[PDB]
RNA sequence: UAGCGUAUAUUAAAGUUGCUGCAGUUAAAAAGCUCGUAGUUGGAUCUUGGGAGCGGGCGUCCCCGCCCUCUCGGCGGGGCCC
């Protein structure tokens, strides 16, 4: 199988040729080759979400992430059309660096490579057509904390059915749980 | 009570020297006012929940083990190892 668009660490292409092939007959399409041949993906997951629903996550290099962000809605529309019954999200590959403890000549860890910043950026990239307008993290009496994220109320018609997939994906690849709301206009 | 009084130094009483812990309108006590160097003090932000068996009951509690590094390992190149 032609796997030309998937750079990796070195090796792993774990039967996820489906996304590469799908992009490959998203070749010869309408007005999408001016902005798709030069940029590619790193990895893809087919995690379980909610009930029997399935969502697929696509990991992208960061400058290539911004270049996906400019054309994401069209590509995700027909790629969901091909992969019927599943939801597609685009996430960067973010490279968290560990916190330096008291244990040769290491460099200063960038603030964007911290886990807090990475989780914030992941939450921002996960919901792309809508914009985050607030955060209402709440400690519920047990030491456990639930995050509540407010979306921009201008893409509610576009994205209101994916919120449980967003919650499942964010629980899967970050570990904490979120809810999504659409407040009245500010 | 075989002891008891007096003088003086000193401690508690004394939160009447105050770190714990005092005061400063009118009782004693805020500089006429502003700048200012030592001194003293100084906003928020970079690892957290799922983690590995013993684990105060995987019992959604958790004795608790976290699922630092590499040049000779010495129990020029075999696993039993440090
Ligand atoms: Mg005294
Ligand atoms: Mg007094
Ligand atoms: Mg007076
Ligand atoms: Mg000074
Ligand atoms: Mg501070």
Curated annotation (Swiss-Prot):
GO terms for biological process: cytoplasmic translation; negative regulation of ubiquitin protein ligase activity; negative regulation of ubiquitin-dependent protein catabolic process; neural crest cell differentiation; neural tube closure; positive regulation of gene expression; positive regulation of intrinsic apoptotic signaling pathway by p53 class mediator; protein stabilization. The gene is RPS7. This is Small ribosomal subunit protein eS7. Belongs to the eukaryotic ribosomal protein eS7 family. InterPro entries: Ribosomal_eS7, Ribosomal_eS7_CS. Phosphorylated by NEK6. Component of the small ribosomal subunit. The ribosome is a large ribonucleoprotein complex responsible for the synthesis of proteins in the cell. Required for rRNA maturation. Part of the small subunit (SSU) processome, first precursor of the small eukaryotic ribosomal subunit. It is found in: Cytoplasm, Cytoskeleton, Microtubule organizing center, Centrosome; Cytoplasm; Nucleus, Nucleolus. It comes from Homo sapiens (Human). Its main location: cytoplasm.
